[PDB]
Ligand binder design. Structure first.
Ligand SMILES: [Zn+2]
Ligand SMILES: [Zn+2]
Length: 305
């Protein structure tokens, strides 16, 4: 069966994401790049490849708000997101709907838009069991208390329409569980979001983020559910040399704790983190072999087990 057929209606149980019968499950997959730039990478052909060939469990649909994203055409972006959610569902994939804030880094900057967007998405897709909602990608320059209060404003909008869906909440310092801004996950544990069926996001780039970030991820997974919605094997820019030795340490920890992940990213951007070589999406593939960057061959190999 497909991932969705095998695990069904996933929910948080204790400090882990579980399938519909209480067994902890690790969902591993890929994140798209921003759809305002790399929409041409997301076709019947590339998505079929991700599902049937790469054996991904999950796809994260990254919708930037600024940077020529959602704010420029709310109707058009929303319609394309409905289409992509349906396409992922038709290939048996779990889907993360990613409200991809970055700059400005205060999520409240985009709150009014977020409520509109998520109200539409949650009403339309309420009957689906395979959609997770990520309400704020990479909060930065803000306190944990302000992220918590943002989450408590948006969560009821979703839950009013779709009460059983899992929501992922971004964390301080570009979702580094506070590490980049001189803090850590203990801050979250002491003042958690007042809702359940919640997970907290962690992002890392293995060439830049070493033992202190790895230790923070281990600490956080003792206290609350974590999903790695964005990670790379290169530096924090999404480019540069890969450190696969460090990446493998993260992969092993995540497998051991059943922490799900989506790798940045499923596009043919020039940066080393984008899994395809430039020109691949314009050529219509192939989505394996000589079209893969080093990071691409590495992740595809992890996903195929
Ligand atoms: Zn097809
Ligand atoms: Zn539902």
């Amino acid at each position: 069966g497909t991932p969705v057929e095998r695990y069904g209606k996933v929910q948080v149980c204790g400090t882990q994401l579980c399938d519909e019968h209480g067994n902890p499950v690790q969902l591993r997959g890929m994140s798209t790049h921003g759809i305002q730039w790399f929409d041409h990478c997301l076709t019947d052909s590339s998505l079929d490849a991700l599902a049937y060939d790469w054996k991904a469990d999950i796809i994260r649909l990254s919708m930037y708000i600024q940077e020529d994203g959602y704010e420029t055409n709310p109707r058009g972006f929303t319609d394309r997101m409905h289409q992509l959610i349906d396409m992922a569902t038709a290939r048996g994939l779990y889907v993360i709907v990613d409200w991809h804030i970055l700059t400005p880094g205060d999520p409240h900057y985009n709150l009014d838009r977020a409520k509109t967007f998520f109200a539409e998405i949650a009403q339309r897709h309420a009957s689906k069991t395979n959609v997770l909602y990520e309400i704020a990608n990479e909060p930065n320059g803000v306190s944990w208390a302000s992220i918590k209060s943002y989450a408590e404003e948006v969560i009821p909008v979703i839950r009013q329409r779709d009460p059983d869906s899992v929501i992922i909440v971004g964390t301080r310092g570009w979702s580094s569980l506070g590490v980049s801004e001189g803090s850590g996950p203990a801050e979250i544990a002491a003042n958690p979001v007042n809702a359940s069926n919640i997970m907290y996001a962690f992002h890392f780039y293995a060439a830049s983020h070493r033992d202190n970030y790895l230790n923070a991820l281990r600490e956080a997974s003792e206290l609350f559910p974590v999903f790695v919605t964005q990670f790379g094997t290169e530096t924090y820019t999404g480019d540069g040399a890969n450190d696969f030795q460090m990446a493998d340490r993260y992969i092993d920890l995540m497998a051991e704790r059943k922490i799900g992940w989506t790798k940045w990213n499923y596009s043919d951007d020039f940066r080393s983190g984008a899994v395809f070589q430039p020109g691949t999406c314009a050529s219509g593939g192939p989505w394996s072999g000589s079209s893969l960057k080093a990071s691409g061959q590495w992740v595809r190999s992890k996903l195929q087990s």
